Amino acid sequence: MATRTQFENSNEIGVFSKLTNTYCLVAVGGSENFYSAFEAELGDAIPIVHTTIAGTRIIGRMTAGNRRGLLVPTQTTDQELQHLRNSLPDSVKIQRVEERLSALGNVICCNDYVALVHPDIDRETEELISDVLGVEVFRQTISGNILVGSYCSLSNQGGLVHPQTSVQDQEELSSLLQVPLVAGTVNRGSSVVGAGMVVNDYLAVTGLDTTAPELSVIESIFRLQ
Amino acid sequence: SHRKYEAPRHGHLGFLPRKRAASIRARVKAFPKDDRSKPVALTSFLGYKAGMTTIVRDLDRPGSKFHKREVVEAVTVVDTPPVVVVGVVGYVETPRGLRSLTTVWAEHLSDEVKRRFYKNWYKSKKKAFTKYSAKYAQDGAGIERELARIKKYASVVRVLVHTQIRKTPLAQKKAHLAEIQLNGGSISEKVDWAREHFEKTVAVDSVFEQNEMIDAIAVTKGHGFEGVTHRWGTKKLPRKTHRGLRKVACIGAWHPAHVMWSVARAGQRGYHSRTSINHKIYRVGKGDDEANGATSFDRTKKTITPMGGFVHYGEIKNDFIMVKGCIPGNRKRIVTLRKSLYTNTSRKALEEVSLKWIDTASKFGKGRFQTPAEKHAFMGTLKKDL
Amino acid sequence: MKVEIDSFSGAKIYPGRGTLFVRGDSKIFRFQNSKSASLFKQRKNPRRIAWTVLFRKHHKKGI
Amino acid sequence: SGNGAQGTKFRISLGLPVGAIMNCADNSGARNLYIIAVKGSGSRLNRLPAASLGDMVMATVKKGKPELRKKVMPAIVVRQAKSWRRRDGVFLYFEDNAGVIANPKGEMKGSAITGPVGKECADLWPRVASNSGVVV
RNA sequence: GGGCGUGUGGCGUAGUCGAGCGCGCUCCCUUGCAUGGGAGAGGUCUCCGGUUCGAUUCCGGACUCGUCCGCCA
RNA sequence: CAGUCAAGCGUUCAUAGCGACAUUGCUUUUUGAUUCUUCGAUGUCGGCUCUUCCUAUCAUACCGAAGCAGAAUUCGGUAAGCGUUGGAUUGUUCACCCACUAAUAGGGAACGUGAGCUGGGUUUAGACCGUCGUGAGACAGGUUAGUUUUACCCUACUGAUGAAUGUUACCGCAAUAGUAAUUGAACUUAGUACGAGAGGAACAGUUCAUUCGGAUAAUUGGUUUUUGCGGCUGUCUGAUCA
RNA sequence: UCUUAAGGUAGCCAAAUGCCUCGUCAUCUAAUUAGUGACGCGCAUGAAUGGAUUAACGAGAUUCCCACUGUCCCUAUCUAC
RNA sequence: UGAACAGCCUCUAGUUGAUAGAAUAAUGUAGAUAAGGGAAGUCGGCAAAAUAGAUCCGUAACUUCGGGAUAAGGAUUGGC
Ligand SMILES: [Mg+2]
Ligand SMILES: [Mg+2]
Ligand SMILES: [Mg+2]
Ligand SMILES: [Mg+2]
């Protein structure tokens, strides 16, 4: 399933949510339908944490997540950090990042094995990503889009990239990430695919205005069947 | 002809006339409505405005974007020594309104309350209530006939109380005396409570408690004669205006051939008695206690007084009320704090408030330190310290 | 609460005190007062202003 | 703001009246935006409609590309440079006035934002938070 | 703003309730200082309703254009 | 500006909404008509500022009707409590566009308001052009430059004292007068009711905001004769210190 | 061809000269009865009543742009008299 | 000091005259400063602000060839 969901009318689910294999994060100011989608589809096996990052309802663009670790900005308060430490399982590691770009979901596009980052990140932050997430890192842009997290949706099975992407960039990124990539649109043609939707190994959640060919492209590239 | 562009009226017509108040202590024009089921308690209290500070607290509003997050708010401090009960009075109700019929005083009156009955205290024989205390020290003869008179009549019982001005850093020495309504029990229970509490002190926590919405009645800060531009907020006339520009241009039409009362004009600004409602109590502090300024999260033993004292006031060695926001009147002014005239739910009047940190830095400048121990620890040793 | 440090002088910043300034290169500065804020806007070096923590650390005064 | 608001906004001190020129932060080829209107502003005699951070305005491109000039379009203020207070009581400000171009529904005409944006704007507009590099 | 009149082919123009000519150019024929001749195409008669049997034509409304008269001390 | 009658329009159907031919009124925010008052002078356009009043109600409150399924809209009632904006051009009133908004309603008060302002226009004397005239000169034709005086009196209004009520002091009562709050968005209800679909509400609840008002100065910003501290120029006190 | 002494030539223009008129087209602006460039059956332009052009100059009149600012949003504070 | 019988301070000389005292309300007259915006004000940028000396670099259209021109636009300045 690519599950049709709105955040109070918003068809961008990746902005307000962060979904990994092991956990899920949702914003505190959410509707009953928005919570019920993650509660029904994810089930009781996977914890869902209602969280606020840096005083903001936006959490997907603020944080970058992995099954092994979670990265939070510097502006995240101690109460939010302690609540995430209690609510999250003991396996994941939560570490604050002290870096100027500070919006880790926009900066970092990552999965379990390999990650794409903004080219201009600091070397200490790159080593921190490689340490906490245990993930090999490449500094690359998707056809000149420096915000790889906003302009790519990535999982273990496959990836969706920006629609206006050069084909040469598509095989280059596909060989670099060792996963097949498809250029496509989400939410009735919105270009920002990573902000448009969240995905993991068995679930994808998207906006209600995402059309049926777009949803078919999602389930084909992410192998959710 | 008609006014070319509509605009709202400058100023509020219900606060007229903008004259000086009759006294420096504002009158309580209305008390909370009585019901004869609760125990006998006062409806108000007297204190002295000391100054303002900031706190940090965790906001609890289920639905706000700042839910479960720290906010910093401005509070004002009212120094409240325990008030002294001297006297009760009863009011019968006539077709021309309420009317007092008797007043029964306490026996021993202190000097600070009997200074209220004098304009030249230093040259006096101090003969005040001397024949009244001579009416006392019999068995009961001239006393409980007036008390049973208040029981037999007098549908409203009010208590004469006076502050303890000598416990404050003020240099006044002459206490303030006021009437406070009792709002519990029958008439006999009210006057029995008053008779038992003659010459006795009543503390502020007996009448107020935390997270209570109260009203502040006080006379505002005076400003003297003021022009119309700041007194009423009218628009300044343009720069090339002959004969001045802090004025109102048209003060009325040809007809009616008089200046109307509703036209904004120059005069006295400030020193008006005001009643400001719905102020939440954050802390009822005890003066017989160190760590007044400490919370459960801060936990450093510091009193509520800032570094260098409150500016123009001094120390807070007595009990105090920390109340949210701004109240009318300036520092060192008598202020009457009153219970609310109605029950407010509002999901804001019912919020339980627990403070996290109280500011005790100096208000006489950009204070960097909360305690002298913290200042000494940060700056190390100096030349004056050996 | 959190007590922040002055970006110019190293003084301790209590909540609701001073100002914050986000520069165009996305760097955050925090000023405890208008004095240190104005010295920052006047582009003075805090290594040469005699009452700052960075000056006293450089000059070994009380260290 | 008005239609495309995702939630409400606390009152920010107004810093950009009508006639203000702010930098154009996105990559749409426009250099500055000239504010002619503020969405949701009230009516008072002689009072200029002023904008704050996170507000949606009507603006014209005074300097930039000729297919963007000489027409009115909606814009969103992302940097204010007039100091305002938050409910945690910090007074903060950027060093320039800056906004991005959008449609009336709020999605950006451009694709990337240079420089910081305010969290009071990023929370209120998700597309701005999507294309934003750093949110403070 | 109001009044009065006006609206035809690509262009100009004739119309009593029963759309013609000229100009542009389609073709053919026919000629230095480049003509002429013969068959062509070309309209929702500004539009919408009613009358009639049928309105360019009569009437009503709308659009459009062109004229004339209009604010203050 | 409002009625009465109703031939017709409205698929059908006079009156949901309109309404010809006729006819009865109201108003003095149009322009006329008249010449009553003022020529030993009532300062004459427009704008700015400010108060109050009227309702023939643009919005907001509660309702009735529909050619009211919902959404949007139209007609009407009680209603003047409350609001009715920012600009480009023009001296303008008016107009016309841009834009926001719940809405950008109409008017009066000596065509409100010049000892309140301004002086762009008009409306002196300088000057230019066009037309007219032989000429001096003329032109609600165009253009440019052109002194805006006085309040200290009475009343009114805003504030401030105060004799006399045996004296003085404290605490009060309340006749009368005034009065104040206003409007919107988002989430949810709910893609629900309704509908064939396109579309698409409302009540209760929550969080904010606009306009207004009354205070206040903990914080932030402004202000500096704290001439408080430091720096700097020129000169003077022989230099130094000051 | 009539009439007249002869019929406005070269130039110029909604110009300080154009009633209609806020003329029409373009440009300038988000929007322009303003400005500029064109057009000309010009109420009523025009040749020492001087026509057209023109560098430099102007306490002359007008429009736009940059800088600048309490002119303004929206007012606040200080000094002397 | 400085280009300078500019402005500012001083020497010789000459005055110390202009009803005064006490407070520091409004509105004035004169002098000033203002966050963010930058003519949205107004008939109209009225008024105010901004620029400013000197050295070096650089300087357009047009022109009656003389100018425009300090065009515009940049950099520097103390003490030892
Ligand atoms: Mg008027
Ligand atoms: Mg009106
Ligand atoms: Mg202070
Ligand atoms: Mg105005």
Q: Please list, in sequence order, all residues whose beta carbon lies within 8 angstroms of the beta carbon of residue D92, skipping any fewer than 6 positions away.
A: C19, C20, C21, C22, D83, D84, D86
As a whole number of angstroms, the distance between CA A168 and CA A173 comes to: 9
How far apart are alpha carbons B353 and B89 in whole angstroms? 38
Q: Is the CB of D21 under 7 A from strand H?
A: yes
Pairing between strand A69-72 and A64-65? Answer: antiparallel
Residue B109, token pair as written in the block: 């009156």
* Rounded distance between C-alpha atoms, residue A71 and residue A20, angstroms: 13
Name the token pair of B370.
Answer: 């909360």
DSSP A153-181: EE-SS-EEE-SS--HHHHHHHHHHHTS-E
CA B277 to C1' F207, whole Å: 23
* Amino acid at position B208, single letter: F
- B318 Cα: distance to centroid of ligand 4 (angstroms): 55
Q: What is the CA radius of gyration of chain C?
A: 12
Sheet holding A17-19, edge to edge: A17-19, A24-27, A48-51
Query: For residue A210, how far is its CA from the centre of ligand 3 (angstroms)?
Result: 58
User: Domains plus CATH for chain B?
Assistant: 16-81+203-220+270-384 (2.40.30.10), 82-202 (3.30.1430.10)
CB contacts < 8 A (B, D): 21
Tokens of residue B281, six digits: 């109590």
Using alpha carbons, list the distances in angstroms from residue B58 to A79, B72, B210, B356: 11, 9, 16, 7
Q: Roughly how many angstroms between the first and final C-alpha of chain C, as a whole number? A: 29
Q: Please, how many CA atoms are within 13 Å of residue B162, restricted to the half-sphere of its CB?
A: 24
Mutation for testing the C interface, residue in B56, B70, B296, B368 having most C CBs under 10 Å:
B368
Handedness of CA D64, D66, D69, D75 (dihedral sign): negative
- Token output for A31: 């509707």
Contacts of D82 (CB under 8 A, 6+ apart): D13, D14, D15, D16, D93
Q: Which nucleotides on strand G sit less than 7 A from a protein beta carbon?
A: 28-31, 70-77
DSSP B384: S
Ligand closest to B238 (CA) is 4
Closest CA to B324 of B72, B76, B53, B66: B76
Residue D40 CA, nucleotide F209 C1', distance (Å): 9
By the 10 Å C-beta count (0-12 exposed, 13-18 middle, 19+ buried), B343 is classed as exposed
Nearest nucleotide by C1' from C14 CA?
A: F219
Cβ contacts of residue A96 below 8 Å, gap of 6+?
A: A72, A73, A74, A76, A81
Nearest DNA or RNA nucleotide to D59 (CA to C1'): G30
The integer distance in angstroms from the CA atom of D35 to the C1' atom of G67 is: 21
Distances, alpha carbon D85 to alpha carbons B70, B338, C16, D24, D109, in Å: 14, 32, 9, 24, 30
Q: Does nucleic acid strand F have an atom less than 7 angstroms from the CB of B275?
A: no
Work out the angle at residue A146's Cα, subtended by the Cα atoms of residues A140 and A152, and round it to the nearest 5 degrees.
80
Q: Which chain A residues in 98-127 lie under 8 Å from chain B, judged by CB atoms? A: none
- The HSE-up count of residue D53 (CA atoms within 13 Å, CB side) is 28
> Which stretch of DSSP H or E encloses residue A13?
helix A13-16
CB–CB contacts below 8 A, A to B: 7
Cβ neighbours around C2 below 10 Å, total: 10
Residues of chain B with C-beta less than 8 angstroms from the C-beta of A80: none
What Å value separates CA A72 and C1' E37? 95
The answer to whether the beta carbons of residues A15 and A21 sit under 8 Å apart is no
CA–CA gap between residue B113 and residue B83 (Å, rounded): 11
For chain D, domain boundaries: 15-136
- Determine the Cα angle at B97 with ends B93 and B99, to 5°: 60
Sequence-ordered list of residues with C-beta below 8 angstroms from that of A84, at least 6 positions apart, any chain: A49, A51, A70, A72, A94
Distance CA A113, CA A134 (A): 8
**Contact yes or no for A17/A27 (Cβ under 8 A):** yes
Helix (H) or strand (E) holding C54: helix C53-58
CA distance B130 to B108: 10
Instruction: Please enumerate in sequence order all residues whose Cβ is within 8 A of that of A70, keeping only pairs 6 or more positions apart, or say none.
Output: A23, A63, A64, A84, A88, A92, A93, A94, A95
- Other C-beta atoms closer than 10 Å to the C-beta of C12 total 15
Cα(A76)–Cα(A99) distance, integer angstroms: 13
Backbone angles phi, psi at D131, to 5 degrees: -90, 0
Q: What share of chain B is helix, strand, coil (3-state, %, to 5)?
A: 15, 25, 60
Q: Which nucleotide is nearest to B235 (CA to C1')?
A: F49
Residues of A numbered 39-98 whose beta carbons fall under 8 angstroms of chain C's beta carbons: which are they? 77-78
- Chain B: nearest CA to C10, how far in angstroms? 11
Q: How far is the CA of A55 from the centre of ligand 2 (A)?
A: 48
Interatomic distance D71 CA / F142 C1' (Å): 38
Work out the burial of residue A163: count CB atoms within 10 Å of its CB; fewer than 13 is exposed, 13-18 middle, 19 or more buried.
Answer: middle
Q: Do C11 and B368 touch (CB under 8 A)?
A: yes
| Least CB–CB distance from C22: residue in D89, D92, D133 | D92
Instruction: Tokens for B212, please give them.
Output: 């209570």
Q: Which of residues 10-49 of C touch B (CB under 8 A)?
A: 11-12, 14-17, 32-33, 35
Pairwise CB contact (< 8 Å): B370 & C15: no
Residues in B 154-193 whose C-beta is less than 7 A from nucleic strand F are 160, 176-179
Q: Considering all nucleic acid strands, name the nucleotide whose C1' atom is nearest to the C-alpha of residue B227.
A: H26
Residue A98's contacts (CB-CB under 8 Å, 6 or more residues apart) are A74
Cα angle B104-B108-B113, degrees, rounded to a multiple of 5: 85
**A30 CA, F10 C1': separation in Å?**
52
Give every CB contact of residue A45 below 8 A, 6+ residues apart in sequence.
none
Q: Distance between CA atoms of A17 and A196, rounded to whole angstroms?
A: 10
CATH class of D15-136: mainly beta
Q: How far is A81 from chain C (nearest CA, A)?
A: 14
User: Distance between CA atoms of B214 and B85, rounded to whole angstroms?
Assistant: 22
Give chain D as a 3 state SS string: CCCCCCCCCCCCCCCECCCCEEEECECCCCCEEEEEEECCCCCCCCCCCCECCCCEEEEEEEECCCCCECCEEEEEEEECCCCEECCCCCEEECCCCEEEEECCCCCECCCCECCEECHHHHCCCHHHHHHCCEEC
Strands B320-324 and B69-79: antiparallel
8-state DSSP, A75: T
- CA geometry: angle D42, B13, D43, nearest 5 deg: 10
- Whether B349 sits with its Cβ under 7 A from any strand F atom: the answer reads no
Residues 6+ apart with CB under 8 A from B190: B40, B157, B182, B184
So where are chain A's domains?
Answer: 1-225
**Sign (positive/negative) of CA torsion C53, C54, C55, C60?**
positive
For chain A, the maximum distance between any two Cα atoms, rounded to a whole number of angstroms, is 46
**What CA–CA distance (Å, rounded) separates D6 from B186?**
57
Q: C18 in the Ramachandran plot: left (φ > 0), alpha (ψ -120 to 50) or beta?
A: left
Single-letter code of the amino acid located at A8: E
Residue C27 to chain A, least CA–CA distance (Å): 7
For residue D53, list chain C residues with Cβ-Cβ distance below 8 A.
none
- Measuring CA to CA, which residue among B210, B248, B256 is closest to residue B230? B248
**Which residues have a Cβ under 8 Å from the Cβ of A103 and sit 6 or more positions away?**
A61, A62, A73, D129, D132, D133, D134, D135
Q: Which has the closest alpha carbon to B154: B214, B100, B85?
A: B100
3-state secondary structure of B377: helix
Residues 6+ apart with CB under 8 A from D48: D17, D18, D19
- Separation of alpha carbons B284 and D122, rounded Å: 41
- Residues in CB range of B162: below 8 A, 6 or more apart: B83, B84, B86, B112, B113, B116, B175, B176, B177, B178
Number of helical (H) and strand (E) elements in chain B, helices listed first? 6, 14
From the CA of B74 to the C1' of F219: give the distance in Å: 8
Separation in Å, CA of C5 to nearest CA in chain D:
14
Give the tokens for residue B174. 């002459």
User: From CA A210, how far away is CA A69, in angstroms rounded?
Assistant: 30
Q: Is B139 on the interface with D (CB under 8 A)?
A: no
Q: How far is B3 from chain D (nearest CA, A)?
A: 12
Residue with structure tokens 């021309």? B96
**Over the range C37-58, which residues count as b (16 or more CB within 10 Å of their CB) and which as e?**
bebbeeeeebeeeeebeebeee
Q: Which among D7, D8, D45 has CB closest to B5?
A: D45
Amino acid in the structure at residue D106:
G
C4 touches strand F (CB under 7 A): no
Q: Are D128 and D117 in contact (CB under 8 A)?
A: yes
Q: List Cβ neighbours of B276 (8 Å cut-off, separation of 6 or more).
A: B215, B216, B217, B327, B328
> What's the CA gap between B196 and B202, in Å, rounded?
12
CATH class of A1-225: alpha beta
The CA distance from B65 to C32, in Å, is 27
B167 φ, ψ to 5°? -85, -10
CA–CA separation, B248 and A11 (whole Å): 55
- The one-letter amino acid code at D101 reads I
